[PDB]
Structures are given as structure tokens and as C-alpha cells.
Design a protein around this ligand. Structure first.
Ligand code: CA
Lengths: 14, 223
């Protein structure tokens, strides 16, 4: 599912 | 941090802010010259900021030190986020005392139900965006593996653990990455990822530090 790292900015995947 | 509280100046002395003209990730001071953070926070030109509370104002007790080298775990996979851990060596040793202090590495892994403290300068909004000036804190429990894997089927490796609340409302969020998850005075986790922030049945996922103690020690010893 759409998951994102909690950095600024986030890095998202699915 | 969503649904947390203001820590209070210098109550989390091992917390660091990674800065590149703005705060982008957190980290934990493990000794006078080494910081532990998340591999995905890697970038060049990192300035480590210690002893911070209000990240937008110089209030006293701050130490700004450039990163000498950043060591991302060799097996870090940016797609799966497996092995999401990075070590940063400081150009100069930090001055330790009360306002700035290191956190200890664990001797054993933490069990489900263990209460931990998560801290950071990340988004305080589950929906929208609101970055705080001061450091936020959140007490959260480590969840069981079965619940963690039920929430994120096929995505949880042995190097990760979930912590937080299944009912939503309290969680780490963007800007908190790389930050500490401290339980019983030991660094047990690193803020890594999640499906959104503070959403129902989607707790935060953290790098399991106890699986990397040997690697951290051997790497520091060689650098
Ligand atoms: Ca400051």
C-alpha cells in the first residue's frame, strides 16, 4: 500500500 | 509528532536535528562523536544540531557540528526500507554534560507492551501540515509482531517493529524520521515509515536497533 518515509520531504512507495 | 506533548527544554538530551538549511530528520547521539539516524535521511552537507529545543531560535545550549562522514548500512534497500539505519560521525566531539548527553544502545530487544518515548520536530497534523518550533514527545507502546504484520502484510521484515496506537490519533510523522524510540533508557528504535500518520490501524514502523548493535560497534571501531 502507499507507504512513506517520515522525512522532509517524504519518500513514498506502494 | 501527532497527538504528543511539548517535551520541555533539555528533557531529551540525546535528540539531534539534522539540518541542511532547514530541519529534515532527527537522530540520536550515542557517544561524543557519533549519531544514529535513518538511512533514508542520507544527503550531503549535513549539519548536526545538538541541545536544541526551539529549532528556529538560538536560545543557548546549542552546538552546531558538521557531519564528517555518513555511513548508510551497506544492505539498505530504499524500496523495502529494510536495514534503514545510518551512522554519522561528527567532525568534532560534542561537549557532553546535562543539556546534551548520549543514549545507551540496547543489550536485548524490547518485548511487546514496553512503553517508549518517541520525540521529534515533525508534523503535528494527521491531516494537513503544521511544523512545531519546539521538540514534541510521545509515549507509545511496542506492538506485537502479529498485529504489526496484520497491519502491513508482506512489508514487515525481522528488522522492523510497530509502535503506536491502532485507534489512531498519536504517531510520529514527516520530520520525525531518524529520531529516537527510547524504552527503559535504551535506544530501541529509529523513526522510519508508515502509511500516513496517526491513521486508524496503521501504526508507525521503526527500525529495530537491537538487531544492529554488533554492526554499529564494529563500524564505529573501524572509523
Ligand atoms: Ca535553538
Amino acid at each position: 500500500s502507499c507507504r512513506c518515509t517520515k522525512s522532509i520531504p517524504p519518500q513514498c512507495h506502494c | 509528532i501527532v497527538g504528543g506533548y511539548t517535551c520541555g527544554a533539555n528533557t531529551v538530551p540525546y535528540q539531534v536535528s539534522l539540518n541542511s538549511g532547514y530541519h529534515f530528520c532527527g537522530g540520536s547521539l550515542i557517544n561524543s562523536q557519533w549519531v544514529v539516524s535513518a538511512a533514508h535521511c542520507y544527503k550531503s552537507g549535513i549539519q548536526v544540531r545538538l541541545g536544541e529545543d526551539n529549532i528556529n531560535v538560538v536560545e543557548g545550549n546549542e552546538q552546531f557540528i558538521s557531519a564528517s562522514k555518513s555511513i548508510v548500512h551497506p544492505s539498505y534497500n530504499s524500496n523495502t526500507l529494510n536495514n534503514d539505519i545510518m551512522l554519522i560521525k561528527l567532525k568534532s566531539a560534542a561537549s557532553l554534560n546535562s543539556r546534551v548527553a548520549s543514549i545507551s544502545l540496547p543489550t536485548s530487544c524490547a518485548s511487546a507492551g514496553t512503553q517508549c518515548l518517541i520525540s521529534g520536530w515533525g508534523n503535528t497534523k494527521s491531516s494537513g501540515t503544521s511544523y512545531p518550533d519546539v521538540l514534541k514527545c510521545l509515549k507509545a507502546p511496542i506492538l506485537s509482531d502479529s498485529s504489526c504484520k496484520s497491519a502491513y502484510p508482506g512489508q514487515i521484515t525481522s528488522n522492523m517493529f510497530c509502535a503506536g496506537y491502532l485507534e489512531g490519533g498519536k504517531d510520529s510523522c514527516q520530520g520525525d524520521s531518524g529520531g529516537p524510540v527510547v524504552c527503559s533508557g535504551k535506544l530501541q528504535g529509529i523513526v522510519s515509515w508508515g502509511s500516513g500518520c496517526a491513521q486508524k490501524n496503521k501504526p508507525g514502523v521503526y527500525t529495530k536497533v537491537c538487531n544492529y548493535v554488533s554492526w554499529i560497534k564494529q563500524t564505529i571501531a573501524s572509523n
